[PDB]
Design a protein around this ligand. Structure first.
Ligand code: 4BQ
Ligand code: YB
Ligand code: YB
Ligand code: YB
Ligand code: ZN
Length: 607
Protein backbone atom coordinates (compact mmCIF):
# COMPACT_ATOMS: atom_id res chain seq x y z
CA UNK A 1 0.00 0.00 0.00
CA UNK A 2 1.07 3.58 -0.69
CA UNK A 3 0.78 6.28 1.97
CA UNK A 4 -1.88 8.71 0.71
CA UNK A 5 -0.98 11.23 3.43
CA UNK A 6 2.63 11.74 2.27
CA UNK A 7 3.90 13.42 -0.88
CA UNK A 8 7.42 12.05 -0.43
CA UNK A 9 9.10 9.19 -2.26
CA UNK A 10 7.61 5.89 -0.98
CA UNK A 11 9.67 3.36 0.99
CA UNK A 12 9.61 1.21 -2.16
CA UNK A 13 11.91 3.76 -3.82
CA UNK A 14 14.18 4.97 -1.02
CA UNK A 15 14.44 4.87 2.76
CA UNK A 16 15.84 7.31 5.30
CA UNK A 17 18.07 5.38 7.66
CA UNK A 18 19.30 8.22 9.83
CA UNK A 19 18.85 11.91 10.60
CA UNK A 20 21.51 14.23 11.95
CA UNK A 21 19.96 17.40 13.31
CA UNK A 22 21.81 20.52 14.37
CA UNK A 23 19.64 23.57 14.94
CA UNK A 24 19.14 26.62 17.14
CA UNK A 25 15.96 27.72 18.92
CA UNK A 26 15.12 31.41 18.44
CA UNK A 27 12.27 32.65 20.64
CA UNK A 28 12.65 36.26 19.53
CA UNK A 29 11.92 35.20 15.97
CA UNK A 30 9.97 31.99 16.72
CA UNK A 31 12.10 29.95 14.32
CA UNK A 32 14.03 26.72 14.34
CA UNK A 33 17.02 27.09 12.06
CA UNK A 34 19.66 24.52 11.19
CA UNK A 35 20.64 21.57 9.03
CA UNK A 36 19.00 18.19 8.60
CA UNK A 37 21.44 15.54 7.41
CA UNK A 38 19.43 12.64 5.99
CA UNK A 39 21.10 9.31 5.26
CA UNK A 40 18.97 7.94 2.43
CA UNK A 41 19.14 4.43 0.96
CA UNK A 42 18.02 3.58 -2.58
CA UNK A 43 15.69 0.62 -3.13
CA UNK A 44 16.05 0.62 -6.89
CA UNK A 45 18.76 0.98 -9.52
CA UNK A 46 19.37 4.31 -11.21
CA UNK A 47 17.78 6.57 -8.60
CA UNK A 48 18.55 10.16 -9.60
CA UNK A 49 16.01 12.28 -7.70
CA UNK A 50 13.76 11.85 -4.67
CA UNK A 51 10.87 13.83 -3.16
CA UNK A 52 10.47 14.81 0.51
CA UNK A 53 7.58 16.28 2.53
CA UNK A 54 7.65 19.90 3.70
CA UNK A 55 5.09 22.32 5.13
CA UNK A 56 5.79 26.06 5.47
CA UNK A 57 9.52 25.41 5.53
CA UNK A 58 12.08 27.92 4.29
CA UNK A 59 14.87 26.08 2.45
CA UNK A 60 18.21 27.89 2.30
CA UNK A 61 20.27 25.21 0.50
CA UNK A 62 20.59 21.49 -0.23
CA UNK A 63 24.14 20.13 0.04
CA UNK A 64 25.43 16.74 -1.12
CA UNK A 65 29.10 15.75 -0.87
CA UNK A 66 30.32 19.24 -0.05
CA UNK A 67 28.51 20.74 -3.04
CA UNK A 68 25.18 22.53 -3.40
CA UNK A 69 22.63 20.70 -5.53
CA UNK A 70 19.40 21.41 -7.41
CA UNK A 71 16.00 21.21 -5.70
CA UNK A 72 12.44 22.32 -6.45
CA UNK A 73 9.46 23.00 -4.18
CA UNK A 74 6.14 22.12 -5.78
CA UNK A 75 2.81 23.83 -5.14
CA UNK A 76 1.35 23.28 -1.67
CA UNK A 77 -1.52 20.80 -1.44
CA UNK A 78 -3.61 22.01 1.51
CA UNK A 79 -2.88 20.13 4.73
CA UNK A 80 -0.27 17.90 3.05
CA UNK A 81 2.12 20.79 2.39
CA UNK A 82 4.54 21.15 -0.54
CA UNK A 83 6.65 18.38 -2.15
CA UNK A 84 10.40 19.03 -2.24
CA UNK A 85 12.17 17.27 -5.12
CA UNK A 86 15.94 16.80 -4.78
CA UNK A 87 18.34 15.97 -7.62
CA UNK A 88 21.16 13.56 -6.83
CA UNK A 89 24.57 14.23 -8.45
CA UNK A 90 25.15 10.48 -8.86
CA UNK A 91 22.53 7.87 -9.77
CA UNK A 92 21.99 5.43 -6.89
CA UNK A 93 21.58 1.68 -7.22
CA UNK A 94 19.87 -0.76 -4.85
CA UNK A 95 21.06 -0.42 -1.26
CA UNK A 96 23.46 2.39 -2.05
CA UNK A 97 23.10 5.42 0.21
CA UNK A 98 23.83 9.15 0.04
CA UNK A 99 23.80 11.80 2.77
CA UNK A 100 21.77 14.90 1.92
CA UNK A 101 22.18 17.92 4.19
CA UNK A 102 19.36 20.48 4.05
CA UNK A 103 19.58 23.97 5.54
CA UNK A 104 16.06 24.91 6.61
CA UNK A 105 14.06 27.42 8.63
CA UNK A 106 10.63 26.79 10.20
CA UNK A 107 7.75 29.25 9.98
CA UNK A 108 6.47 30.76 13.24
CA UNK A 109 3.13 29.34 12.04
CA UNK A 110 4.45 25.76 12.05
CA UNK A 111 1.52 23.42 12.72
CA UNK A 112 3.92 21.12 14.59
CA UNK A 113 4.85 23.78 17.11
CA UNK A 114 3.31 26.03 19.70
CA UNK A 115 5.38 29.05 20.73
CA UNK A 116 4.33 30.37 24.12
CA UNK A 117 5.12 33.84 25.44
CA UNK A 118 6.34 33.98 29.06
CA UNK A 119 2.92 35.13 30.29
CA UNK A 120 1.53 31.81 29.00
CA UNK A 121 3.80 29.76 31.27
CA UNK A 122 3.69 28.96 34.97
CA UNK A 123 6.78 31.03 35.72
CA UNK A 124 5.95 34.19 33.75
CA UNK A 125 9.67 34.89 33.26
CA UNK A 126 10.59 32.61 30.35
CA UNK A 127 9.07 31.56 26.98
CA UNK A 128 8.35 27.93 26.09
CA UNK A 129 8.22 25.76 22.96
CA UNK A 130 6.92 22.24 22.32
CA UNK A 131 6.32 20.07 19.26
CA UNK A 132 3.66 17.55 18.30
CA UNK A 133 4.38 15.78 15.02
CA UNK A 134 1.80 12.97 14.91
CA UNK A 135 0.29 12.35 12.58
CA UNK A 136 1.89 14.37 9.78
CA UNK A 137 3.43 17.51 11.22
CA UNK A 138 7.11 16.49 11.29
CA UNK A 139 7.33 17.90 7.77
CA UNK A 140 6.49 21.29 9.30
CA UNK A 141 9.70 21.14 11.30
CA UNK A 142 12.05 19.70 8.66
CA UNK A 143 12.02 18.00 5.23
CA UNK A 144 11.47 14.25 5.46
CA UNK A 145 9.60 11.20 4.25
CA UNK A 146 6.71 12.02 6.57
CA UNK A 147 5.22 8.53 6.70
CA UNK A 148 5.19 5.83 9.42
CA UNK A 149 6.32 3.29 6.81
CA UNK A 150 9.87 4.59 7.22
CA UNK A 151 11.96 4.23 10.37
CA UNK A 152 15.26 5.99 11.06
CA UNK A 153 17.72 6.51 13.88
CA UNK A 154 18.66 10.10 14.73
CA UNK A 155 21.10 12.29 16.64
CA UNK A 156 20.54 15.91 17.62
CA UNK A 157 22.37 18.99 18.81
CA UNK A 158 20.20 22.01 19.59
CA UNK A 159 21.28 25.49 20.67
CA UNK A 160 19.07 27.30 23.16
CA UNK A 161 19.36 30.26 25.57
CA UNK A 162 21.56 29.12 28.45
CA UNK A 163 18.81 29.75 30.99
CA UNK A 164 16.56 27.25 29.19
CA UNK A 165 16.56 23.45 28.92
CA UNK A 166 15.99 21.36 25.79
CA UNK A 167 14.70 17.77 25.74
CA UNK A 168 14.07 15.37 22.86
CA UNK A 169 12.63 11.92 22.21
CA UNK A 170 16.13 10.50 22.64
CA UNK A 171 18.82 9.75 25.21
CA UNK A 172 20.34 12.93 26.63
CA UNK A 173 23.94 13.03 25.40
CA UNK A 174 25.39 15.83 27.51
CA UNK A 175 25.37 19.63 27.45
CA UNK A 176 28.10 22.19 26.77
CA UNK A 177 28.36 25.96 26.42
CA UNK A 178 27.70 26.92 22.80
CA UNK A 179 31.23 27.50 21.43
CA UNK A 180 29.95 29.59 18.53
CA UNK A 181 29.60 32.67 20.75
CA UNK A 182 26.43 33.47 22.63
CA UNK A 183 25.63 32.73 26.25
CA UNK A 184 23.63 29.95 24.60
CA UNK A 185 23.85 26.31 25.63
CA UNK A 186 23.85 23.38 23.22
CA UNK A 187 22.14 20.09 24.08
CA UNK A 188 22.94 16.71 22.54
CA UNK A 189 20.67 13.70 22.00
CA UNK A 190 20.94 10.22 20.53
CA UNK A 191 18.19 7.83 19.45
CA UNK A 192 19.75 4.46 18.59
CA UNK A 193 16.44 2.70 17.91
CA UNK A 194 14.90 3.29 14.48
CA UNK A 195 11.59 5.17 14.77
CA UNK A 196 8.92 6.65 12.46
CA UNK A 197 9.44 10.41 12.10
CA UNK A 198 6.20 11.22 13.97
CA UNK A 199 8.03 10.16 17.13
CA UNK A 200 10.55 12.99 16.86
CA UNK A 201 9.84 15.51 19.61
CA UNK A 202 11.44 18.67 21.01
CA UNK A 203 10.70 20.82 24.07
CA UNK A 204 12.52 23.97 25.21
CA UNK A 205 11.78 25.88 28.39
CA UNK A 206 12.65 26.63 32.01
CA UNK A 207 12.56 22.95 32.92
CA UNK A 208 13.33 21.30 36.24
CA UNK A 209 13.40 17.57 36.95
CA UNK A 210 12.87 15.11 39.79
CA UNK A 211 13.74 11.42 39.87
CA UNK A 212 10.87 9.06 40.69
CA UNK A 213 12.27 5.84 39.29
CA UNK A 214 15.60 4.18 38.39
CA UNK A 215 15.01 5.04 34.73
CA UNK A 216 12.48 7.85 35.14
CA UNK A 217 12.79 11.58 35.74
CA UNK A 218 9.74 13.87 35.74
CA UNK A 219 10.16 17.20 33.91
CA UNK A 220 8.09 20.39 34.14
CA UNK A 221 8.29 24.00 35.29
CA UNK A 222 9.19 24.43 38.97
CA UNK A 223 5.62 24.99 40.13
CA UNK A 224 4.37 21.64 38.81
CA UNK A 225 7.41 19.50 39.68
CA UNK A 226 6.38 18.36 43.17
CA UNK A 227 2.79 17.60 42.16
CA UNK A 228 3.88 15.69 39.06
CA UNK A 229 6.45 13.64 40.96
CA UNK A 230 3.68 12.56 43.33
CA UNK A 231 0.98 11.97 40.70
CA UNK A 232 3.09 9.67 38.55
CA UNK A 233 4.91 7.76 41.30
CA UNK A 234 3.58 4.38 40.14
CA UNK A 235 5.41 4.75 36.84
CA UNK A 236 8.23 2.25 37.47
CA UNK A 237 5.89 -0.51 38.65
CA UNK A 238 3.82 -0.08 35.48
CA UNK A 239 6.97 -0.32 33.34
CA UNK A 240 7.83 -3.64 35.00
CA UNK A 241 4.36 -5.05 34.38
CA UNK A 242 4.53 -3.81 30.80
CA UNK A 243 7.90 -5.51 30.32
CA UNK A 244 6.35 -8.74 31.60
CA UNK A 245 3.53 -8.45 29.06
CA UNK A 246 5.35 -7.21 25.97
CA UNK A 247 8.95 -8.30 26.41
CA UNK A 248 12.04 -6.17 27.16
CA UNK A 249 11.84 -2.38 27.25
CA UNK A 250 14.48 -1.49 24.68
CA UNK A 251 14.54 2.30 24.89
CA UNK A 252 16.67 2.72 28.01
CA UNK A 253 15.19 5.72 29.79
CA UNK A 254 11.50 6.33 30.43
CA UNK A 255 11.24 10.03 31.32
CA UNK A 256 8.02 12.08 31.64
CA UNK A 257 7.41 15.66 30.52
CA UNK A 258 4.42 17.57 31.93
CA UNK A 259 3.59 20.25 29.37
CA UNK A 260 1.63 23.55 29.51
CA UNK A 261 -2.19 23.28 29.78
CA UNK A 262 -2.50 23.82 26.03
CA UNK A 263 -0.95 20.44 25.17
CA UNK A 264 -3.70 19.02 22.87
CA UNK A 265 -3.70 15.35 23.99
CA UNK A 266 -3.71 13.34 27.20
CA UNK A 267 -0.25 12.10 26.29
CA UNK A 268 2.18 11.39 23.46
CA UNK A 269 4.39 8.30 23.35
CA UNK A 270 7.59 10.14 22.36
CA UNK A 271 10.43 7.59 22.77
CA UNK A 272 12.48 8.02 25.97
CA UNK A 273 10.29 10.99 26.95
CA UNK A 274 6.52 10.60 27.20
CA UNK A 275 4.58 13.89 27.08
CA UNK A 276 1.48 14.30 29.28
CA UNK A 277 -1.21 16.93 29.86
CA UNK A 278 -1.20 18.76 33.22
CA UNK A 279 -4.90 17.87 33.39
CA UNK A 280 -3.71 14.48 34.69
CA UNK A 281 -2.70 16.15 37.96
CA UNK A 282 -5.78 15.12 39.95
CA UNK A 283 -3.84 14.81 43.19
CA UNK A 284 -4.75 11.16 43.82
CA UNK A 285 -3.12 9.32 40.89
CA UNK A 286 -6.57 8.36 39.63
CA UNK A 287 -5.76 9.28 36.01
CA UNK A 288 -2.64 7.10 35.78
CA UNK A 289 -4.22 4.86 33.11
CA UNK A 290 -2.94 7.51 30.68
CA UNK A 291 0.62 6.79 31.84
CA UNK A 292 0.06 3.02 31.46
CA UNK A 293 -1.20 3.80 27.96
CA UNK A 294 1.89 5.82 26.96
CA UNK A 295 4.13 3.14 28.47
CA UNK A 296 2.45 0.42 26.41
CA UNK A 297 3.25 2.32 23.20
CA UNK A 298 6.90 1.51 23.97
CA UNK A 299 5.96 -1.78 22.28
CA UNK A 300 2.73 -1.41 20.29
CA UNK A 301 3.23 1.70 18.18
CA UNK A 302 6.90 2.57 18.68
CA UNK A 303 8.34 -0.93 18.08
CA UNK A 304 5.58 -2.36 15.91
CA UNK A 305 4.20 0.58 13.93
CA UNK A 306 1.26 1.16 11.60
CA UNK A 307 2.67 1.30 8.05
CA UNK A 308 0.12 3.95 7.02
CA UNK A 309 -2.40 5.94 9.03
CA UNK A 310 -5.22 3.85 7.52
CA UNK A 311 -4.10 1.11 9.95
CA UNK A 312 -3.87 3.39 12.97
CA UNK A 313 -6.07 1.03 14.97
CA UNK A 314 -3.11 -1.37 15.24
CA UNK A 315 -1.22 1.25 17.28
CA UNK A 316 -4.14 2.19 19.52
CA UNK A 317 -6.25 -0.94 19.88
CA UNK A 318 -3.27 -2.97 21.06
CA UNK A 319 -2.03 -0.23 23.37
CA UNK A 320 -5.43 0.20 25.01
CA UNK A 321 -5.47 -3.59 25.43
CA UNK A 322 -2.06 -3.57 27.18
CA UNK A 323 -2.94 -0.40 29.13
CA UNK A 324 -5.94 -2.14 30.63
CA UNK A 325 -3.99 -5.30 31.50
CA UNK A 326 -1.45 -3.15 33.38
CA UNK A 327 -4.22 -1.49 35.38
CA UNK A 328 -5.89 -4.87 35.84
CA UNK A 329 -2.69 -6.34 37.29
CA UNK A 330 -2.39 -3.33 39.57
CA UNK A 331 -6.01 -3.10 40.77
CA UNK A 332 -7.73 -6.34 39.78
CA UNK A 333 -9.41 -8.11 36.88
CA UNK A 334 -12.74 -6.60 37.96
CA UNK A 335 -11.28 -3.14 37.39
CA UNK A 336 -10.02 -4.23 33.96
CA UNK A 337 -13.55 -5.26 33.01
CA UNK A 338 -14.97 -2.00 34.38
CA UNK A 339 -12.59 0.03 32.21
CA UNK A 340 -13.31 -2.24 29.24
CA UNK A 341 -17.05 -1.66 29.58
CA UNK A 342 -16.55 2.07 29.98
CA UNK A 343 -14.59 2.00 26.72
CA UNK A 344 -17.51 0.41 24.90
CA UNK A 345 -19.61 3.27 26.23
CA UNK A 346 -17.16 5.77 24.73
CA UNK A 347 -17.42 3.88 21.43
CA UNK A 348 -21.23 4.22 21.53
CA UNK A 349 -20.80 7.97 21.98
CA UNK A 350 -18.34 8.27 19.07
CA UNK A 351 -20.60 6.27 16.75
CA UNK A 352 -23.69 8.31 17.65
CA UNK A 353 -21.74 11.56 17.19
CA UNK A 354 -20.36 10.64 13.75
CA UNK A 355 -23.42 8.68 12.74
CA UNK A 356 -23.53 4.90 12.30
CA UNK A 357 -22.88 4.99 8.54
CA UNK A 358 -19.98 7.45 8.83
CA UNK A 359 -16.66 6.28 7.26
CA UNK A 360 -14.73 7.35 10.36
CA UNK A 361 -16.51 4.65 12.42
CA UNK A 362 -14.80 1.92 10.41
CA UNK A 363 -11.81 0.25 12.08
CA UNK A 364 -9.60 0.38 8.98
CA UNK A 365 -10.08 3.80 7.36
CA UNK A 366 -9.25 5.58 4.09
CA UNK A 367 -7.62 8.95 4.65
CA UNK A 368 -7.31 9.87 0.98
CA UNK A 369 -7.86 13.63 0.93
CA UNK A 370 -8.74 13.69 4.64
CA UNK A 371 -6.77 15.75 7.15
CA UNK A 372 -5.73 13.22 9.86
CA UNK A 373 -6.38 15.74 12.65
CA UNK A 374 -9.99 15.96 11.47
CA UNK A 375 -10.52 12.19 11.34
CA UNK A 376 -9.02 11.60 14.81
CA UNK A 377 -11.37 10.13 17.44
CA UNK A 378 -11.70 7.37 20.02
CA UNK A 379 -12.97 4.93 17.36
CA UNK A 380 -9.60 3.30 16.57
CA UNK A 381 -8.86 3.11 20.32
CA UNK A 382 -12.14 1.55 21.40
CA UNK A 383 -13.28 -0.37 18.34
CA UNK A 384 -9.73 -1.70 18.19
CA UNK A 385 -9.78 -2.66 21.86
CA UNK A 386 -13.23 -4.23 21.50
CA UNK A 387 -11.98 -6.46 18.68
CA UNK A 388 -9.00 -7.68 20.72
CA UNK A 389 -11.15 -8.24 23.85
CA UNK A 390 -13.65 -10.23 21.78
CA UNK A 391 -10.84 -12.36 20.34
CA UNK A 392 -9.40 -12.80 23.84
CA UNK A 393 -12.68 -14.35 24.98
CA UNK A 394 -13.09 -16.29 21.73
CA UNK A 395 -9.63 -17.85 21.82
CA UNK A 396 -9.64 -18.97 25.44
CA UNK A 397 -8.85 -16.10 27.78
CA UNK A 398 -6.26 -13.41 28.67
CA UNK A 399 -3.39 -15.80 29.36
CA UNK A 400 -3.68 -17.26 25.87
CA UNK A 401 -4.18 -13.98 24.06
CA UNK A 402 -1.33 -12.26 25.88
CA UNK A 403 0.91 -15.02 24.56
CA UNK A 404 -0.18 -14.03 21.07
CA UNK A 405 0.47 -10.37 21.82
CA UNK A 406 4.05 -11.00 22.96
CA UNK A 407 4.82 -13.14 19.91
CA UNK A 408 3.19 -10.46 17.75
CA UNK A 409 5.44 -7.80 19.27
CA UNK A 410 8.54 -9.99 18.87
CA UNK A 411 7.64 -10.87 15.29
CA UNK A 412 7.21 -7.29 14.06
CA UNK A 413 9.59 -5.26 16.22
CA UNK A 414 11.30 -2.39 14.38
CA UNK A 415 8.88 -2.91 11.47
CA UNK A 416 5.88 -1.05 10.03
CA UNK A 417 2.87 -3.25 9.26
CA UNK A 418 -0.66 -3.37 7.86
CA UNK A 419 -3.88 -4.85 9.21
CA UNK A 420 -3.28 -7.84 6.94
CA UNK A 421 0.16 -8.56 8.41
CA UNK A 422 -1.50 -8.59 11.82
CA UNK A 423 -4.38 -10.85 10.83
CA UNK A 424 -2.55 -13.61 9.02
CA UNK A 425 0.02 -13.68 11.79
CA UNK A 426 -2.98 -14.12 14.09
CA UNK A 427 -4.03 -17.05 11.89
CA UNK A 428 -0.50 -18.46 11.93
CA UNK A 429 -0.08 -18.18 15.70
CA UNK A 430 -3.48 -19.78 16.22
CA UNK A 431 -3.19 -22.40 13.49
CA UNK A 432 -4.71 -24.92 15.91
CA UNK A 433 -7.83 -22.75 16.19
CA UNK A 434 -8.40 -21.55 12.63
CA UNK A 435 -11.95 -22.90 12.75
CA UNK A 436 -12.61 -20.60 15.70
CA UNK A 437 -11.01 -17.68 13.86
CA UNK A 438 -13.21 -18.37 10.83
CA UNK A 439 -16.22 -17.77 13.07
CA UNK A 440 -15.51 -14.05 13.42
CA UNK A 441 -17.14 -11.58 11.03
CA UNK A 442 -13.89 -10.07 9.77
CA UNK A 443 -15.55 -7.93 7.09
CA UNK A 444 -17.89 -6.32 9.61
CA UNK A 445 -15.23 -5.76 12.29
CA UNK A 446 -12.58 -4.40 9.91
CA UNK A 447 -14.61 -2.66 7.23
CA UNK A 448 -18.18 -1.92 8.37
CA UNK A 449 -19.22 1.43 9.91
CA UNK A 450 -21.10 1.60 13.21
CA UNK A 451 -21.00 -0.52 16.36
CA UNK A 452 -19.17 -3.89 16.13
CA UNK A 453 -21.27 -6.88 14.97
CA UNK A 454 -21.04 -8.47 18.42
CA UNK A 455 -20.49 -7.19 21.98
CA UNK A 456 -17.90 -8.86 24.24
CA UNK A 457 -18.81 -10.11 27.73
CA UNK A 458 -18.07 -7.79 30.65
CA UNK A 459 -17.99 -8.44 34.37
CA UNK A 460 -20.51 -6.06 35.95
CA UNK A 461 -19.32 -5.94 39.56
CA UNK A 462 -18.05 -2.36 39.71
CA UNK A 463 -20.46 -1.03 37.06
CA UNK A 464 -23.72 -2.03 38.76
CA UNK A 465 -23.79 0.81 41.30
CA UNK A 466 -23.16 3.34 38.53
CA UNK A 467 -26.08 1.99 36.52
CA UNK A 468 -28.37 2.04 39.56
CA UNK A 469 -27.63 5.68 40.41
CA UNK A 470 -27.75 7.03 36.84
CA UNK A 471 -31.08 5.29 36.26
CA UNK A 472 -32.47 6.78 39.49
CA UNK A 473 -31.55 10.26 38.29
CA UNK A 474 -32.68 9.65 34.71
CA UNK A 475 -36.09 8.34 35.85
CA UNK A 476 -36.51 10.54 38.95
CA UNK A 477 -39.71 12.48 39.47
CA UNK A 478 -40.47 15.37 41.81
CA UNK A 479 -41.12 13.07 44.78
CA UNK A 480 -37.68 11.41 44.45
CA UNK A 481 -35.56 14.56 44.56
CA UNK A 482 -35.51 14.94 48.35
CA UNK A 483 -34.29 11.37 48.85
CA UNK A 484 -31.02 11.95 46.99
CA UNK A 485 -28.16 12.53 49.42
CA UNK A 486 -24.37 12.79 49.59
CA UNK A 487 -24.58 9.29 51.07
CA UNK A 488 -25.38 8.00 47.57
CA UNK A 489 -21.69 8.48 46.77
CA UNK A 490 -20.36 6.82 49.94
CA UNK A 491 -18.83 3.69 48.41
CA UNK A 492 -18.03 5.03 44.94
CA UNK A 493 -14.49 5.56 43.68
CA UNK A 494 -13.66 8.58 41.53
CA UNK A 495 -13.65 6.11 38.62
CA UNK A 496 -17.25 5.16 39.37
CA UNK A 497 -18.27 8.81 39.82
CA UNK A 498 -16.97 9.51 36.33
CA UNK A 499 -18.81 6.48 34.91
CA UNK A 500 -21.99 7.55 36.68
CA UNK A 501 -21.78 10.95 34.98
CA UNK A 502 -20.95 9.38 31.60
CA UNK A 503 -24.04 7.17 31.77
CA UNK A 504 -26.17 10.14 32.82
CA UNK A 505 -24.75 12.33 30.05
CA UNK A 506 -25.82 9.79 27.41
CA UNK A 507 -29.43 10.68 28.32
CA UNK A 508 -29.07 14.46 28.62
CA UNK A 509 -30.78 16.80 28.89
CA UNK A 510 -32.07 16.12 32.36
CA UNK A 511 -34.66 18.58 33.72
CA UNK A 512 -32.97 21.74 35.03
CA UNK A 513 -34.33 21.21 38.54
CA UNK A 514 -32.74 17.75 38.65
CA UNK A 515 -29.30 19.07 37.77
CA UNK A 516 -29.64 21.83 40.35
CA UNK A 517 -30.50 19.25 43.02
CA UNK A 518 -27.57 17.11 41.89
CA UNK A 519 -25.14 19.95 42.67
CA UNK A 520 -27.07 20.45 45.91
CA UNK A 521 -26.54 16.88 47.12
CA UNK A 522 -23.23 15.92 45.47
CA UNK A 523 -21.31 19.22 45.12
CA UNK A 524 -19.70 18.24 41.79
CA UNK A 525 -18.75 21.90 41.29
CA UNK A 526 -15.99 21.38 43.86
CA UNK A 527 -14.30 18.41 42.15
CA UNK A 528 -11.16 19.30 40.21
CA UNK A 529 -10.58 15.88 38.63
CA UNK A 530 -10.61 16.83 34.95
CA UNK A 531 -12.49 13.82 33.55
CA UNK A 532 -15.26 14.24 36.11
CA UNK A 533 -15.50 18.04 35.82
CA UNK A 534 -15.57 17.74 32.02
CA UNK A 535 -18.59 15.42 32.01
CA UNK A 536 -20.37 17.27 34.84
CA UNK A 537 -20.15 20.61 33.01
CA UNK A 538 -21.26 19.02 29.72
CA UNK A 539 -24.29 17.64 31.59
CA UNK A 540 -25.03 21.06 33.13
CA UNK A 541 -24.77 22.89 29.82
CA UNK A 542 -26.80 20.41 27.77
CA UNK A 543 -29.42 20.60 30.54
CA UNK A 544 -29.60 24.38 30.09
CA UNK A 545 -28.16 25.55 33.42
CA UNK A 546 -27.01 29.11 32.82
CA UNK A 547 -24.94 29.21 36.02
CA UNK A 548 -22.64 26.58 34.51
CA UNK A 549 -21.74 28.82 31.55
CA UNK A 550 -18.79 30.63 33.13
CA UNK A 551 -17.50 27.35 34.59
CA UNK A 552 -17.55 25.72 31.14
CA UNK A 553 -15.97 28.68 29.33
CA UNK A 554 -13.26 28.73 32.00
CA UNK A 555 -12.34 25.05 31.67
CA UNK A 556 -12.47 25.25 27.86
CA UNK A 557 -9.91 28.06 27.73
CA UNK A 558 -7.72 27.48 30.81
CA UNK A 559 -6.53 24.20 29.32
CA UNK A 560 -6.47 22.95 25.75
CA UNK A 561 -6.68 19.17 25.79
CA UNK A 562 -8.90 18.70 22.74
CA UNK A 563 -10.84 15.88 24.41
CA UNK A 564 -12.21 18.50 26.82
CA UNK A 565 -11.95 21.77 24.92
CA UNK A 566 -13.68 20.84 21.66
CA UNK A 567 -16.84 19.35 23.21
CA UNK A 568 -17.16 22.16 25.77
CA UNK A 569 -17.05 24.83 23.04
CA UNK A 570 -19.49 22.75 21.03
CA UNK A 571 -22.00 22.36 23.87
CA UNK A 572 -21.73 26.10 24.65
CA UNK A 573 -22.38 26.97 21.00
CA UNK A 574 -25.47 24.74 20.97
CA UNK A 575 -26.86 26.43 24.12
CA UNK A 576 -28.73 29.51 22.91
CA UNK A 577 -27.85 31.45 26.06
CA UNK A 578 -24.08 30.92 25.71
CA UNK A 579 -23.68 30.79 21.93
CA UNK A 580 -22.54 34.38 21.30
CA UNK A 581 -20.11 34.40 24.22
CA UNK A 582 -18.75 31.02 23.11
CA UNK A 583 -17.90 32.37 19.65
CA UNK A 584 -16.53 35.63 21.07
CA UNK A 585 -14.40 33.76 23.60
CA UNK A 586 -12.91 31.60 20.86
CA UNK A 587 -12.13 34.59 18.61
CA UNK A 588 -10.32 36.30 21.50
CA UNK A 589 -8.31 33.18 22.37
CA UNK A 590 -7.47 31.55 19.06
CA UNK A 591 -4.28 33.57 18.52
CA UNK A 592 -2.88 32.16 21.76
CA UNK A 593 -4.10 28.58 21.17
CA UNK A 594 -2.21 25.58 19.83
CA UNK A 595 -2.48 25.79 16.01
CA UNK A 596 -4.23 22.46 15.44
CA UNK A 597 -6.69 23.05 18.30
CA UNK A 598 -7.43 26.58 17.08
CA UNK A 599 -8.16 25.17 13.62
CA UNK A 600 -10.44 22.38 14.87
CA UNK A 601 -12.53 24.53 17.24
CA UNK A 602 -12.92 27.08 14.46
CA UNK A 603 -14.34 24.35 12.21
CA UNK A 604 -16.45 23.10 15.11
CA UNK A 605 -17.83 26.59 15.76
CA UNK A 606 -18.11 27.21 12.02
CA UNK A 607 -16.25 30.53 12.07
N1 4BQ B 1 -0.71 9.07 20.11
C1 4BQ B 1 -1.18 9.78 21.31
C2 4BQ B 1 -2.31 10.78 20.96
C3 4BQ B 1 -1.98 11.66 19.75
C4 4BQ B 1 -2.40 11.01 18.43
O1 4BQ B 1 -2.58 9.79 18.36
N2 4BQ B 1 -2.65 11.89 17.44
C5 4BQ B 1 -3.02 11.58 16.17
C6 4BQ B 1 -3.39 12.63 15.32
C7 4BQ B 1 -3.92 12.36 14.04
C8 4BQ B 1 -4.07 11.04 13.59
O2 4BQ B 1 -4.60 10.84 12.32
C9 4BQ B 1 -4.73 9.45 11.91
C10 4BQ B 1 -5.95 8.75 12.03
C11 4BQ B 1 -6.02 7.42 11.60
C12 4BQ B 1 -7.22 6.70 11.74
C13 4BQ B 1 -8.35 7.32 12.29
C14 4BQ B 1 -8.28 8.66 12.72
C15 4BQ B 1 -7.08 9.38 12.58
C16 4BQ B 1 -3.68 9.98 14.44
C17 4BQ B 1 -3.16 10.24 15.72
C18 4BQ B 1 -1.74 8.76 22.30
O3 4BQ B 1 -2.48 7.88 21.83
O4 4BQ B 1 -1.43 8.89 23.50
YB1 YB C 1 16.19 34.56 5.47
YB1 YB D 1 15.10 34.00 8.74
YB1 YB E 1 -42.75 8.48 42.75
ZN1 ZN F 1 -2.24 5.76 22.06
Amino acid sequence: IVDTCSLASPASVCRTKHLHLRCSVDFTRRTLTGTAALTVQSQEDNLRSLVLDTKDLTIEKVVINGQEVKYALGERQSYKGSPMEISLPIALSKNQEIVIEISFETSPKSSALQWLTPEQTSGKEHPYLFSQCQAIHCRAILPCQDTPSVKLTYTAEVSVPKELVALMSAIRDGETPDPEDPSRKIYKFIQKVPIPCYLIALVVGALESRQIGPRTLVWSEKEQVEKSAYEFSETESMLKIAEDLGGPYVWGQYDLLVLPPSFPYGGMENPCLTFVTPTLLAGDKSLSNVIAHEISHSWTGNLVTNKTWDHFWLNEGHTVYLERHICGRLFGEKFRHFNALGGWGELQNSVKTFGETHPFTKLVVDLTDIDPDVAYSSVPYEKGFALLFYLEQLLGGPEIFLGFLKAYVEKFSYKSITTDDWKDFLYSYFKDKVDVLNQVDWNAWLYSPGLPPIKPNYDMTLTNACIALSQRWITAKEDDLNSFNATDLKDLSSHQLNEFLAQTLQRAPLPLGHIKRMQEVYNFNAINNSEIRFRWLRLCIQSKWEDAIPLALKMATEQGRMKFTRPLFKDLAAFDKSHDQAVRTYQEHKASMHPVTAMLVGKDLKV
